[PDB]
Amino acid sequence: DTEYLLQENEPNLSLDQHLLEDLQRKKTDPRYIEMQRFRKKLPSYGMQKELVNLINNHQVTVISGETGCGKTTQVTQFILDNYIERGKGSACRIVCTQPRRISAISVAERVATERAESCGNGNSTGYQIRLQSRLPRKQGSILYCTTGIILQWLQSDSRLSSVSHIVLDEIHERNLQSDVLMTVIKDLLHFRSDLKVILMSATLNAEKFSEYFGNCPMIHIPGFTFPVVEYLLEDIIEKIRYVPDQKNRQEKEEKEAIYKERWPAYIKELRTRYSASTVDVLQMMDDDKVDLNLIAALIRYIVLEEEDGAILVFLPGWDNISTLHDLLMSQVMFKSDKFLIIPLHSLMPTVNQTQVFKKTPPGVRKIVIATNIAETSITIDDVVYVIDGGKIKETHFDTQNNISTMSAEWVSKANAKQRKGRAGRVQPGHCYHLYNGLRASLLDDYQLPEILRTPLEELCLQIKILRLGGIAYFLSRLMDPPSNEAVVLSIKHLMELSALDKQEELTPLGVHLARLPVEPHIGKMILFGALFCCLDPVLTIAASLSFKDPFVIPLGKEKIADARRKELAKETRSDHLTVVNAFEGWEEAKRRGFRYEKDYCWEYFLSSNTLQMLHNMKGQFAEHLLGAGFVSSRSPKDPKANINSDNEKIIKAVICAGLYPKVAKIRLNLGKKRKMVKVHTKSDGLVSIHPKSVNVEQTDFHYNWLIYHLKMRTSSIYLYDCTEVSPYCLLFFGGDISIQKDKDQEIIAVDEWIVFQSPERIAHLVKGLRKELDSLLQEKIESPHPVDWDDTKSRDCAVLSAILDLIKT
C-alpha cells in the first residue's frame, strides 16, 4: 500500500511542457469544456486565484467552507492546474486525506471525471485505501487517501518525502487519527520547508486550528445551497397527520435536567400553535429510539404528496438502517421497480456502497438510508428531501469505572446543519428533523472531540510504532490533550496486555498489534486465533465483542429465550462459545435455505441483521490478518487456519489472550438458592453476573476463574458476558508469575492476586515458553509469514505446540 509514497518527487521540464500542451488540447475537448461549466458554478471556482495565492505564499493555511462550497473536489485541482498553467506542472504531488474509504474513492472518481479522465491508470487523479487503489501518474498528480493510509506511510517514510502538498480535509470531525496526524505534520513542517500543508474545515469554528498551527492564515469559502425548508417533529406530525401503528455523563445529565424542567411549559405553549392530536402524539414519542414507522409514513407522504426527488435518510447505525429497509420493502408500494432503496454504512463491503452510480430514469426514485457518513463529500445525485433521524453513534469513555460504550446520541447543531445542506444542492429542498423544538434549542454547538471521549490504547500503539517518544508527553502536545486518567489507564492496559514492557517500549507482540487497525484486545485475540489455527470461531467472538451479540429478548418470551440460550451453551460455561454455537447453527441453517434460516432465528431469538453484520466483520478481520502476514487466505473458513477450531480448550485460551486482565474469581455457591451468583475482581471487589449470561445461575463450575468483556454499572457492577477458564490460560497469557510454597503445596501467583495450586516446574516452563514466543514474534517483524502447521519440526510449530499442550492442561 506504500507504492505512491516510495516514488520520488522529480520535477521535469519536458513533462512540464507536455502537461501545458495537454491543457491546450483539453480546452478544445467537448467533454472537458462541458465539465468546466459545471465547476464554474461552485463558489470555490470564483475565488480560485486567492486560494492558490494564499497556499503559494504560506507554508500552512486553514480553509473554511460550508456545504456546497466545493473545497474537497476543487482545491486540489486549483493547486495542480496553477502549477500546470505556470509551466511547473511536474512539481506537484498532492495528497488529500478523507475520513472514510468511500469518500476517498468517490471524490477521486468525481475529480477524474471533471478532468475528462478515468480514475488512476496513469492519469492525473487517483486514490489509495487499504488493499485497494487506482494510482495516478507519478508527477503532477492528485491522490485521495484515508488518514489510515498516511499513518501507515509514516512507518516507511516518516518525512513524507515525495509529497509536495498535504491536504487534510474534513478536520472539523475531530477523529482520533486526524488529531495525531495533525501534531505529527506540525513537527515535520517546521523541519522541512518545502512541504505545503492545507487544513480544510466544513464548519466555521476553525480558528482553533489556526491558533494550533501558530496563528497561520485563514480563508473562507462561501457555501452553496438553494433554500431548504426545515421541519421539526411537531411540523412533521402535523403535516402528515401521523397515525402510529402502536398507541454521555454529567454534562448530558445537566441538559436532560433542563429539558425536563422546560418540558411542561413547552408542551403547554405548543398547544397554542398546533393541533391537539399533534401534541398528544409528540408527547408519546420515545427519546431513546428513532421512530422508523414515522420515517416510513413520512416517506410515504413525500412520494404521494410531493414533487420528484431523491430521499436521503440519516440513521445512527446498521441496526436502524436494515430495520427501516425491511420495513419499507414489506410494503407493496416500495416493492416497485420505480424505487431504488440503498443502504449506506461504513462497515458493509467496499463498493457495496453502491450509491454513487448514475441513477436510471427518474421514473425510478432513489431512497438512500445512510449513517452520518453521508454528511461528508459523497456523490448522491438529485436529493431534494433529507430525513434527519436526529441521532449519531458516539463512543464515550467512563474512566472512573473503566467502561467504554457506543451509543446513539443527539446530533450537534453542526451535524444538523450538514444534514440540512444535503437537501439544497440541486433545487429548493426539505429537511425533516425528528427532534422536537425544545430538543433543538438544547443541542450542543459541536460534538466533543473523540480524543476526549475514547479509550487510547490503539492511538498509544501508533505513537510507539512511529517512534514519537514518550506517550504521555506526545499526547500532551495534541490540540486537545486527553485527560491524565485516560492516559494512565491506556498505558496500564497495554502493559497488562504485554504490548508494552514496564519501560513503555514495544514488545514484539506490541509491534504486531500496532499493525492491526483494531483495538489491541481485539488485535491480540485475532492474532492468536491465527497462530493457534482457531481462526473461524475466534473471529466470530471478536466480531461479537466489537459490534454486539445477536441475541434478543422478545416480550413474554423472556423465560423461553433464556432456556434456549443456555441450551446453546451446552456444557461450555461460556457466553462467548454460546455465540459461536449460535453462529454456526445459523450458517448451517442458511445452507438449507432461507426458511430454515428464519426458523433458526425465531427458535433461538437471534437477530438476522446482527448475524449478517458479524459475518462481514469476520471477513474484515481476516483481511487485516492477511495483510499482517498471519494467514495465507482472506477466508475465515480456510481449512489450514482452522485445524483447531473445534477444540474448546484452545479457543478458550485465545479468548483469555484477548480479554486478560478482565478476570474474576468465582465465589462458591454452596447450594444456597437465596444467594445470587457473585465473583471477586481485582479492581471492583465482589460483583454480580448479569441475568443475560448463561452463567448467571450456574452452580456447577469446573474451574474458579472467569474472563469477561462487558461490565456495566447501574445500582452496582454486573458482568455481561463471561467464560470459565482454567488457571493455565491465565498462567500463560496473564501478568507476572511468582512462586510461593506453604509446606507441602506448590503455588503459582499471577499478577499477585490470581493464586492457584500448581507445580513449580510449570511456572518455569511457562516463563521459558513466553520468552520463546517473544522470539518467534520477533522474527516475524521483518519477515511476516504464516506459521506452516503442516511442517512439524519447524521450531515455530514446536514452540506453539508446547503452548497448546500446556493450555490443554
Where do contacts with Cl ion occur on this chain (CB under 5 A)? 603
- Closest distance of CB 569 from Cl ion, Å: 15
**CA-CA distance, 473 to 521, in Å (whole number)?**
24
Three-state secondary structure call for residue 781: helix
- Closest distance of CB 589 from Cl ion, Å: 13
- Closest distance of CB 782 from Cl ion, Å: 53
- Closest distance of CB 567 from Cl ion, Å: 9
Q: 464 vs 565, which CB is nearer to Cl ion?
A: 565
Widest CA span in the chain: 95
Q: 45 vs 600, which CB is nearer to Cl ion?
A: 600
* Contact between residue 550 and residue 607 where contact means Cβ atoms under 8 Å apart: yes
Q: 253 vs 603, which CB is nearer to Cl ion?
A: 603
**CA-CA distance, 625 to 633, in Å (whole number)?**
9
Q: 287 vs 603, which CB is nearer to Cl ion?
A: 603
| Helix, strand, coil percentages, rounded to 5, for the chain | 45, 15, 35
**CA-CA distance, 139 to 124, in Å (whole number)?**
8
Q: All 3 cell numbers of residue 515?
A: 499493525
Q: 334 vs 605, which CB is nearer to Cl ion?
A: 605
Please choose, from the candidates 359, 345, 376, 242, the residue with its C-alpha nearest in 3D space to the C-alpha of residue 310.
359
- Closest distance of CB 327 from Cl ion, Å: 24
- Closest distance of CB 326 from Cl ion, Å: 21
List, as one string, the DSSP characters of 56-114. Answer: HH-SEEEEEE-TTS-HHHHHHHHHHHHHHHHT-GGG-EEEEEESSHHHHHHHHHHHHHH
Q: Which element (helix H / strand E) includes 341?
A: strand 339-344
**CA-CA distance, 573 to 551, in Å (whole number)?**
17
Q: 550 vs 734, which CB is nearer to Cl ion?
A: 550
**CA-CA distance, 114 to 615, in Å (whole number)?**
38
Give residue for cell 419499507. Answer: 328
- Closest distance of CB 560 from Cl ion, Å: 6
**CA-CA distance, 330 to 326, in Å (whole number)?**
6
Q: 94 vs 582, which CB is nearer to Cl ion?
A: 582
Give residue for cell 410494503. Answer: 331
- Closest distance of CB 592 from Cl ion, Å: 17
* Contact between residue 210 and residue 244 where contact means Cβ atoms under 8 Å apart: no
The gap from C-alpha 748 to its chain's centroid, in whole angstroms, comes to: 40
- Closest distance of CB 479 from Cl ion, Å: 53
- Closest distance of CB 697 from Cl ion, Å: 19
Q: 21 vs 603, which CB is nearer to Cl ion?
A: 603
The gap from C-alpha 387 to its chain's centroid, in whole angstroms, comes to: 23
Q: 308 vs 558, which CB is nearer to Cl ion?
A: 558
Please choose, from the candidates 695, 476, 413, the residue with its C-alpha nearest in 3D space to the C-alpha of residue 565.
695
- Closest distance of CB 540 from Cl ion, Å: 22
- Closest distance of CB 445 from Cl ion, Å: 49
Q: 381 vs 603, which CB is nearer to Cl ion?
A: 603
Q: 584 vs 746, which CB is nearer to Cl ion?
A: 584
Q: 34 vs 603, which CB is nearer to Cl ion?
A: 603
**CA-CA distance, 505 to 530, in Å (whole number)?**
24
Residue nearest to Cl ion (CB): 603
How many other CB atoms are there within 10 angstroms of residue 714's CB atom?
A: 6
Q: 457 vs 549, which CB is nearer to Cl ion?
A: 549
Three-class secondary structure assignment of 520-578: HHHHHHHHHHHHCCCHHHHHHHHHHHHCCCCECCCCCCHHHHHHHHHHHHCCCCEHHHH
- Closest distance of CB 586 from Cl ion, Å: 14
Dihedral angle computed from the Cα positions of residues 291, 297, 298 and 304, in that order, rounded to the nearest 10 degrees: 170
**CA-CA distance, 478 to 471, in Å (whole number)?**
11
- Closest distance of CB 602 from Cl ion, Å: 7
Distances (CA, A) of 75 to 107, 166, 169, 196, 701: 12, 12, 10, 13, 64
Three-state secondary structure call for residue 3: helix
Q: 308 vs 603, which CB is nearer to Cl ion?
A: 603
- Closest distance of CB 603 from Cl ion, Å: 4
Question: Which residues have a Cβ under 8 Å from the Cβ of 127 and sit 6 or more positions away?
Answer: 104, 105, 107, 108, 109, 119, 120, 133, 134, 143, 144, 145
Q: 83 vs 586, which CB is nearer to Cl ion?
A: 586
- Closest distance of CB 555 from Cl ion, Å: 15
Please choose, from the candidates 228, 235, 229, 230, the residue with its C-alpha nearest in 3D space to the C-alpha of residue 436.
235
- Closest distance of CB 606 from Cl ion, Å: 10
- Closest distance of CB 564 from Cl ion, Å: 5
Q: 595 vs 761, which CB is nearer to Cl ion?
A: 595
Please choose, from the candidates 449, 567, 465, 469, the residue with its C-alpha nearest in 3D space to the C-alpha of residue 509.
465
Q: 603 vs 788, which CB is nearer to Cl ion?
A: 603
Question: Which residues have a Cβ under 8 Å from the Cβ of 502 and sit 6 or more positions away?
Answer: 495
Three-state secondary structure call for residue 241: coil
**CA-CA distance, 178 to 172, in Å (whole number)?**
10
**CA-CA distance, 447 to 293, in Å (whole number)?**
28
Q: Which element (helix H / strand E) includes 122?
A: none
DSSP state of 506: B
Q: 78 vs 605, which CB is nearer to Cl ion?
A: 605
